[PDB]
Nucleic acid binder design. Structure first.
Lengths: 644, 534
RNA sequence: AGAUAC
């Protein structure tokens, strides 16, 4: 009655998969059918009652690997009812356990994410009687023993845990549950600080309901009398509340929303108007001087932990092995580019690179860097994965530069110093140049090879909009090549690494041979893995990313593995930690993807404001989405809400 | 260094000063303090063996974020950054972390409008069409409802009536009842509370104060995600709705309607003076109904609540023709069928009838209607009830939705309804029938079915067989060529309830034919009714 | 929603 999580990595959505759907969140369902046409790519699921449910793939909340609409099929009835009854029965105890370890895993300074599967593991492995003698150590012993490994998970506990977290989400004990789209499984969940989120909101609710919502009525009076100073000093907890709403931090607690409805309802100018995130924002500007950034999941500092860590990054300063190759007397980026990696050796800046004395990750900047799985790049702002000092030092830019740096492919720490001033545009434009021409032609040969031999292979305080060159063909092709070759080196040397991985199907393949919209609801997505898998978009070979060590954590880890290995030391990471780290990376990449698309939608729509039963549409404007699918004035637009 | 000792002194003192601020659970801070000091003393005292082993190790980032306070002192010693300020600050931070760890261990449903946050999150408008029966109150709202792009009725018959009228106007309106599925028209109990429409109509809104049925009207009123919510009913509903609209912030526009036609109570009635167009009202006391109708038939020249709908319609048409002259009704005449009744005759007045019920029955003679009693004492009691002012309802009855009491699970409702009581203008259901059905695995459906209908045990045995048929995850019932036919009809209908709820009971169309067989036979049995079970 | 640069 347990299953291995690796088969999620090893499999895609399939018949027999047991899932929870967003429509039918309160009951388990079973995948009974695949997408039926190019025209309609939705899935079919059967409930325990035998009723069908049709849903888009992204509606899957969690997934269990297997272990024409004939009404007669007990098979499903039996699986779903059995696991559901058991989870349901297991649940109240799970709620108590969740409350308790929330008390222990939570950090008062701020929001802190956890591998969700790990959480499930913890919930399974804890006995309440023992959890009360030699307690606190028993628990942290059950948390380390959580990590210890087999790796298998009970489905029932998984479901019960999910339900438990949502119910306690109503109390602001946990944050939103994030589900990875590739594996269609939950990756991570944030744990909100008890003092700041539970007690604070609870106090606010009592304060606001007190004396028949006296504080609310009095406030709406103040807003109506426009004496905002008193609001400022006396009622800043309400500004806090509206802000927390705007960030999408408390969007799911119904009570804070009814409370806020009463607040808006009592204020004259906004009276009788829709309760939206946008409205809380507009309302806030009308009261504060000079909102997506407020999101707790967006690890922005403004957040006490992100502020502590950024205080570390501000305050930080970094034995180069003579065993390094000298490249002697031998980079297409934007003008406004921050780190130039094209490969830099940030791993060298860490003691872990050479110190096999201490197991695991011991260094503070390294540990923080790994928590931020990537550099965070947004049109609004940038949060570099590495501190500024270290990026300034390690960036490759006439400078002594420490480094790691038909057709046939010849399978069989550095220093560099001559650096030419160049840009993507500059590269596109026109002896060294001849070398470059040879390179572009070579790149075209690489792409042609990948295409014909490997069966290899969407654009567009002041918002601006824009919409692939020879230069881009060049860089992308050589990056893909480098990463494949290093995949091969790691595999051949048996080095554990973080890897990157009907009529409708025929129509898709034909379309493969404009209107990529129709192909788009049949998409595969990337996922990180502790074991090698082909990246079937790029080719038929394993794919291991080493090209971006300063903005991607997995590359950085790959760099540490190379450093230890090349100097014939024991490797930094055994496969098991590789897996853990990989899970955290996937979580933070997904999270970033979500908030990136959120921010782009917000700004696009805000520009618009400044200027298959689905009723989905698109603009020419890529991120403005609101019978003949794929074929080619609205009422309302509220960007913060994502409403169009 | 004794200097450092003095530093720890003034530092800890400074911490006391920063631990004398608020009384709002200052005790936690106190305990944090004692644990602090104790941890220091213990540190140096136990250090007797690891004094230097302590004093060997420096710090880094933990100095800005006091990670592990399992050992403070050695770090304070070996501190070297590039003055006392470092000391006081660092220890203050440490204390804060101790408060993170110590203000954490072992230290520890009357707003139903809140149950519909999505509805509370939008402007909702209430239009109250208030008045007597026979006032035109329903038509303005129904016409507003058509031009839109849902109707909630109390009865399958009224839902049918609106369906029929809409179909005759060329407009595809589906039907959704407990038993029948064809804009949308339904019973109030079948209303979806998650489909953001544009207009909802709630008829007979005063049935919100039914002790047994009233939750659906309250729930629909509070929870319907509609731009306009039109409520039609009597004026006895107005103050609560204002109080209700007070809790939603929703604008309330009231529209008042008077009787379209006059009505009067006669002096004294003369049973031979019963007359064509007389309706003799016997309540659900079908034994009384049956006996009276057979007697009055046996001289010169029937609708009750437990009759099937088709039979009732046939009875109305027959009555509207001179193949039928008088009619006996029940309080089931209070609503439904559109009937041409000249004169109401009350058979009787075991509790007394409410003033409201008398008014509701009497207003169906709608332009001069007449009312009287069989017995003079009742005649005057009726004149009193009839002339009694608009009694106002004090409260609105409520029931937890599926979602909420599933959340409560986390006979539990004994407790839920008790704490619901333990707000002030909200009622708890009776649910005595529901608890009865609860006398009887899935839990969710057990709730979902605890609202299924039956009598007070043939209905109970059929229900058992149904629960058993649920546990395995339809015939035992023969008639060919009276109390038995009414019971069988109710079981075939119950079957229709589950089939409309669980298309995985299959009989369907063929079972519809079976229903008509119970109906014709009951009809013919009632027309030819030569005796009657009293 | 895939890929490189950031």
């Amino acid at each position: 009655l347990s299953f291995d999580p690796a088969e999620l990595l090893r499999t895609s959505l399939n018949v027999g998969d047991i899932v929870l759907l967003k429509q039918c969140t309160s009951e388990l369902t079973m995948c009974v059918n695949l997408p039926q046409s190019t025209t309609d790519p939705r899935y079919t699921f059967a409930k325990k009652d035998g009723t069908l449910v049709y849903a888009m793939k992204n509606s899957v909340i969690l997934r269990i690997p297997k272990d024409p609409v004939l009404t007669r099929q007990l098979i499903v009835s039996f699986t779903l009812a059995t696991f559901t009854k058991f989870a349901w029965t297991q649940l109240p105890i799970v709620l108590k356990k969740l409350e308790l370890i929330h008390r222990y895993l939570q950090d008062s300074r701020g929001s802190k994410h956890v591998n969700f599967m790990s959480l499930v593991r913890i919930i399974k492995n804890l006995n309440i009687k023992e959890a009360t003698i030699n307690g606190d150590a028993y628990v942290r012993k059950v948390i380390d023993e959580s990590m210890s490994v087999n790796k298998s998970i009970d489905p029932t506990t998984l479901l019960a845990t999910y339900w438990g977290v949502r119910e306690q989400q109503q109390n602001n004990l946990w944050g939103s549950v994030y589900t990875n789209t590739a594996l269609l499984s939950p990756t991570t969940v944030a744990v909100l600080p008890l003092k700041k989120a539970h007690l604070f909101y609870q106090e606010v609710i009592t304060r606001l309901e007190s004396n028949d919502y006296q504080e609310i009525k009095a406030f709406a009076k103040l807003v109506n009398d426009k004496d905002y100073h008193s609001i400022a000093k006396r009622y800043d907890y309400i500004r806090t509340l509206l802000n927390d709403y705007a960030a999408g931090n408390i969007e799911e607690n119904a009570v804070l929303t009814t409370i806020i409805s009463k607040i808006f309802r009592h204020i004259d100018m906004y009276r009788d108007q829709d309760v939206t995130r946008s409205l809380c924002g507009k309302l806030l500007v009308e009261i504060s001087p000079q909102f997506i950034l407020g999101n707790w999941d967006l690890n922005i500092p403004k957040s006490g932990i992100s502020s502590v860590e950024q205080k570390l990054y501000d305050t930080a300063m970094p034995v180069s092995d003579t065993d390094r190759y000298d490249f002697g007397d031998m980079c297409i980026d934007s003008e406004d580019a921050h780190e130039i990696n094209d490969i830099a050796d940030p791993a060298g800046l860490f003691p872990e690179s050479f110190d096999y004395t201490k197991s695991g990750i011991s260094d503070d900047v390294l540990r923080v860097s790994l928590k931020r799985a990537f550099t965070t790049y947004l049109p609004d702002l940038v949060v570099p994965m590495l501190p500024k000092s270290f990026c300034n030092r390690a960036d490759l830019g006439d400078r002594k530069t420490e480094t790691i740096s038909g057709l046939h492919v010849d399978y069989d720490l550095g220093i560099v110093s001559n650096f030419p001033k160049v840009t993507y545009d500059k590269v596109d434009s026109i002896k060294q140049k001849k070398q470059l021409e040879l390179l572009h032609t070579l790149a075209t040969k690489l792409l042609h090879k990948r295409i014909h031999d490997d069966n290899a292979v969407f654009n567009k305080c002041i918002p601006t909009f824009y919409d692939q060159t020879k230069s881009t063909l060049l860089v992308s092709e050589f990056m893909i090549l480098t990463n494949k070759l290093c995949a091969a080196f790691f595999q051949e040397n048996k080095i554990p690494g973080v890897y990157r991985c009907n009529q409708a199907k025929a129509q898709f393949e034909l379309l493969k041979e404009k209107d990529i919209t129709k192909i788009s609801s049949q998409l595969s997505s990337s996922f990180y893995s502790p074991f090698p898998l082909p990246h079937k978009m790029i080719g038929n070979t394993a794919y291991l990313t080493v090209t971006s060590p300063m903005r991607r954590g997995p590359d950085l880890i790959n760099h540490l593995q190379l450093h230890r290995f090349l100097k014939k030391l024991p490797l930094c990471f055994k496969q098991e930690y590789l897996d853990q780290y990989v899970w955290s990376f996937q979580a933070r990449a997904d999270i970033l993807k979500i908030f990136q698309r959120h921010s782009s939608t917000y700004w696009t729509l805000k520009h618009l404001e400044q200027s298959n039963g689905t009723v989905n549409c698109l603009f020419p404007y890529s991120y403005a989405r609101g019978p003949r699918i794929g074929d080619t004035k609205v009422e309302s637009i509220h960007p913060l809400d994502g409403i169009l | 260094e004794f200097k450092k000792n003095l530093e720890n002194a003034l530092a800890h003192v400074y911490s006391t000063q920063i631990e004398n601020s608020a009384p709002d659970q200052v005790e936690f801070r106190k305990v944090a303090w004692l644990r602090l000091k104790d941890m220091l003393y213990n540190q140096l005292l136990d250090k007797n063996l690891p004094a230097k082993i302590n004093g060997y190790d420096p710090g880094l980032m933990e100095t800005i974020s006091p990670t592990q306070p399992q050992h403070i002192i050695p770090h304070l010693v070996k501190m070297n950054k590039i003055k006392y300020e470092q000391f006081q600050y660092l220890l203050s931070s440490y204390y804060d972390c101790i408060l993170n760890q110590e203000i954490i261990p072992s230290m520890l449903f009357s707003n139903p409008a809140e149950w519909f946050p999505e509805a509370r999150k939008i402007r909702r408008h209430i239009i109250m069409h208030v008045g007597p029966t026979n006032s035109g109150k329903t038509f303005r709202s129904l016409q507003k409802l058509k031009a839109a792009d849902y109707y909630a009725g109390p009865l399958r018959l009224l839902a049918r009536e609106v369906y029929e009228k809409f179909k005759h106007e060329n407009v595809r309106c589906n039907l959704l009842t407990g038993e029948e599925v064809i804009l949308t028209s339904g019973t109030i109990e079948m209303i979806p509370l998650n489909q953001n429409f544009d207009v909802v109509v709630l008829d007979e809104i005063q049935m919100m104060a039914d002790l047994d049925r009233g939750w659906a009207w309250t729930n629909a009123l509070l929870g319907a995600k509609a731009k306009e919510v039109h409520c039609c009913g009597e004026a006895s509903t107005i103050p609560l709705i204002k109080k209700i609209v007070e809790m939603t912030g929703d604008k309330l526009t009231i529209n008042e309607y008077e009787r379209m036609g006059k009505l009067v109570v006669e002096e004294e009635a003369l049973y031979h003076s019963l007359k064509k167009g007389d309706c003799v009202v016997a309540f659900s006391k079908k034994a009384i109904l049956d006996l009276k109708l057979e007697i009055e038939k046996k001289t010169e020249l029937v609708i009750y609540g437990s009759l099937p709908p088709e039979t009732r319609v046939k009875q109305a048409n027959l009555f509207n023709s001179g193949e039928f002259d008088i009619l006996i009704a029940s309080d089931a005449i209070g609503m439904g069928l559109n009937l041409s009744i000249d004169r109401v005759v009350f058979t009787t007045s075991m509790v007394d009838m409410t003033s409201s019920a008398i008014k509701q029955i009497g207003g169906r003679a709608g332009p001069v209607g007449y009312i009287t009693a069989v017995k003079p004492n009742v005649l005057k009691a009726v004149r009193e009830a009839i002339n009694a002012p608009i009694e106002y309802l004090t409260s609105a009855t409520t029931w937890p939705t599926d979602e909420i009491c599933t959340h409560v699970m986390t006979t539990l409702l004994e407790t839920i309804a008790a704490d619901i009581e333990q707000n002030k203008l909200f009622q708890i259901c009776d649910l005595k029938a529901r608890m009865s059905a609860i006398e009887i695995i899935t839990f969710s459906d057990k709730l979902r079915l605890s609202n299924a209908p039956l009598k007070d045990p043939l209905v109970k045995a059929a229900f058992k067989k149904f629960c058993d048929t649920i546990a395995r995850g339809s015939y035992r019932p023969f008639d060919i060529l009276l109390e038995e036919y009414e019971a069988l009809y109710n079981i075939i209908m119950l079957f229709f309830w589950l089939s409309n709820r669980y298309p995985n009971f299959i009989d369907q169309e063929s079972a519809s034919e079976l229903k008509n067989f119970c109906e014709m036979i009951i009809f013919e049995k009632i027309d030819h009714l030569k005796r009657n079970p009293y």
